[PDB]
Amino acid sequence: LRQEAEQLKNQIRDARKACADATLSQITNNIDPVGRIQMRTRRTLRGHLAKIYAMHWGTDSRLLVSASQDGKLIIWDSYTTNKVHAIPLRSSWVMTCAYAPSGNYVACGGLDNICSIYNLKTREGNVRVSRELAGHTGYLSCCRFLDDNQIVTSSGDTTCALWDIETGQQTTTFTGHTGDVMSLSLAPDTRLFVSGACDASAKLWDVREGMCRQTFTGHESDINAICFFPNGNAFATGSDDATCRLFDLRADQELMTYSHDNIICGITSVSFSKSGRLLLAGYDDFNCNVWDALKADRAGVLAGHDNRVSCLGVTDDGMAVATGSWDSFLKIWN
Amino acid sequence: DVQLVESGGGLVQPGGSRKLSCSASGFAFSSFGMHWVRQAPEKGLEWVAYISSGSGTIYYADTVKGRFTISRDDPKNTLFLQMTSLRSEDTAMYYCVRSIYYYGSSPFDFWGQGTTLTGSDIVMTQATSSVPVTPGESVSISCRSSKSLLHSNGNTYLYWFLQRPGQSPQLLIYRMSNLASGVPDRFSGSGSGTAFTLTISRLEAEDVGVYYCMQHLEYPLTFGAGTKL
Amino acid sequence: IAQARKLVEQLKMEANIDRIKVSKAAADLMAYCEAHAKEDPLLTPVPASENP
Amino acid sequence: TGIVETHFTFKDLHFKMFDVGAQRSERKKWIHCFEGVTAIIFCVALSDYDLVLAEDEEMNRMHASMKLFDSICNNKWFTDTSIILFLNKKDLFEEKIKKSPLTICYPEYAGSNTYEEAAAYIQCQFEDLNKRKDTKEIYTHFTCSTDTKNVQFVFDAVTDVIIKNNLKDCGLF
Amino acid sequence: VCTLRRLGLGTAFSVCYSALLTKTNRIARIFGGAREGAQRPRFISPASQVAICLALISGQLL
Amino acid sequence: ILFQPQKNVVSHRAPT
Amino acid sequence: SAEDKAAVERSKMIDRNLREDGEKAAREVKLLLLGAGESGKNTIVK
């Protein structure tokens, strides 16, 4: 019962306090901040005709895919800014998109509880639907490609399930969290997809083994987006209370909090850079923001979006960041 | 299944001419560019004409400029080609070619069965005409061009075909560094600027054929001399 | 069964709390940023940008 | 369990209603994902002003709709869209209008249970919840138990807001 | 003075009678969208109407 | 606007 | 710039396809059914 869990709840807090007393994440205070990194313009990709919620890059940092309410999934390339696949979409109420690591498949999901899989490389000049994924009652909040065959996606039914595109079935079910699950972020090791659920608690999961090893709490309001640090030693979680945090893996606790007095909005998307020193943001004031994770200070502010951003992505080789604004504009800032 | 069987050209006479009809099956014709290729009984391949998607762009060869007319029927999924005042040099067997153009695409990846009809351009020259080969050996085929094919975008325009005896050629390597779909990983190519080579290891019995190399920079589409293997 | 599931799940975090770091987590992120500072092109402008 | 978009066309205008509700998630996470809509339709059961939720045992069936209706109109997302009101099963309501006192829903109401009179008070109680009503319009309708002629009203209701929306941007209004 | 007398007389009776045409067209087209539905007609905007008003005026200048 | 104020009424295409 | 020119030509064609679908999507009215269930929603959708 809850009486037994009370002792366990207090026991883990004592261990967390011991780690919190060892360091303060500000012992150095001499990280030599770069300063003004104001990347301005030179990318004004257009083509959509409705609101945009997702924008995912490729492994080669060449192909960019975005999903909109118009029911048209479009694949873009930043270099030549010309549309390559203006493929149609069965569901108009979509909220996420995914791009295969091998550059062969894309995924879409929305309020219809369908995770459609499309094969880009087909010997017919037109993509087809690989199969229809069903089994969720909530909504495809965020979808990612675990590999070329196995994928992991979120749902609005507090259930994250691994999928098998070969035949179609939920190999594993992770229905062990109360709030709503909003987004997930994978790992280069292809083993961790820590959640960004609505109840302000990030729960870690293990691929092919249903279990939770650590839960990260300490956020107010809701959580809308989550990222993952490149080396796997930490990750950043974006809450809806205009606050950000950096949850370390070994420390398993919050060590930094990024929030200014004047700003009160929320985070809709967050993503690290290659080095991880500079962290981007998703503030809802019709503009994006960047925070320096080294000096714990704001590096700069960039704007130019008529509507507030909804998606954000950093290329795997850097030197390009895209913003999925609610307006039908995607800009790669450089 | 993809079928590009073409019906049309046969016995003709000087002055009189007649048209071609290439029928599509198993694929979307409206989203593909289409090409025609001549093969003389004693010579190699040759460009004829090209129709883009939606008939938005029209091209013709110098030898048939103002003489041949190209047209397509997207609803009928059939491709036509009008001919006027056929000459003796036009006596050759025609090819129907399927192609698409986008980032990462594989142009000239499928060819039709084929029917039998009875200066500024970049010069494609192959110094070798034939090579005796044995199973299990390694052979290198060198293809050279009069103009460098390396564009500022960082990609070159090289295409390779293998002439099976009695059927249509098949694409092997496109852009000199990408293998076509269905082609084994054994086939490979290398080059820089104008000295392009193709490397084959562990020769098999089926590997016998004639290799042709093309260029696509600008648009003087010409075929190579052809090396017999 | 909800109470039983909650208590059996709680011991996993307590058991995982044994593998805990005091200062390695902070040093690991700082070392990674410094080591990969040259590789990252966002912090330092480059003259050979692929998106001009 | 997802939403259902039904098609129906009348008088040379195509309509695509969205049956959103089966969704049992936050809803708010996709409430904003249902904007740009010209108008919304709110269905109210007239013969529910007495019924009380058995599980809650404290919240009335009609009073529960009052909280939902107030939240929908008062949010910042739906400030630029009109409201269409539908009343269902008036035959049972008319039968219960005297059988069950209007007080059961409106204790303050003390007027004769006469349908015409009661229907008037409950209709006026729908629109007095929004803080701002200058840019908000409500098109109340009574429909029917079979609702054979309700298609004409919704066709006229959208036409009123289609013209109004166009004039707002053009500055003519 | 003689040069702009022809310009002055032509433009004044063209500016006055072109704004009325745009106003009548804008009202008629907006109320003429009964056949269509839930869509915003093009060229009806405060910025676009000024430009289209000068298009008819500039025709007289030519 | 001036001679008879206090009206300030403009209406849409109202059929009822 | 040969294949790039053809790629731009394909982009222009599918740009028109997206453009023409914009009017069709905008030519249809959108209505949202709201309220508690079993309150008459069946009689207005059948």
Author numbering:
A (entry chain B): 7 to 340
B (entry chain H): 1 to 118, 135 to 245
C (entry chain C): 9 to 60
D (entry chain A): 182 to 354
E (entry chain 2): 631 to 692
F (entry chain 2): 817 to 832
G (entry chain A): 6 to 51
Direct quotes from the study:
To allow the G protein binding, the helical bundle of mGlu2 undergoes a notable anticlockwise rotation (extracellular view), which switches the dimer interface from helices I/VI/VII (mGlu2)–helix VI (mGlu4) to helix VI (mGlu2)–helices I/VI/VII (mGlu4). The G protein binding to the mGlu2 subunit in mGlu2–mGlu4 most likely results from distinct binding modes and modulation mechanisms of the mGlu2 and mGlu4 PAMs that co-bind to the heterodimer, which will be discussed later (see the next section). Similar to what was previously observed in the mGlu2–Gi1 structure, the mGlu2 PAM JNJ-40411813 binds to a pocket formed by helices III, V, VI, and VII within the mGlu2 subunit of mGlu2–mGlu4. Unexpectedly, the mGlu4 PAM ADX88178 adopts a completely different binding mode. Instead of binding inside the helical bundle, it occupies a binding site in the asymmetric dimer interface in the Gi1–mGlu2–mGlu4 structure and forms extensive contacts with both subunits mainly through hydrophobic interactions. The different modulation mechanisms of these PAMs agree with our Gi1–mGlu2–mGlu4 structure in the presence of both JNJ-40411813 and ADX88178, in which the mGlu2 subunit binds to the G protein.
The metabotropic glutamate receptors (mGlus) play critical roles in modulating synaptic transmission and neuronal excitability, and dimerization is mandatory for these receptors to exert their functions. In addition to homodimers, these class C G protein-coupled receptors (GPCRs) were shown to form heterodimers as well. The Venus flytrap domains undergo a sequential conformational change, while the transmembrane domains exhibit a substantial rearrangement from an inactive, symmetric dimer with diverse dimerization patterns to an active, asymmetric dimer in a conserved dimerization mode.
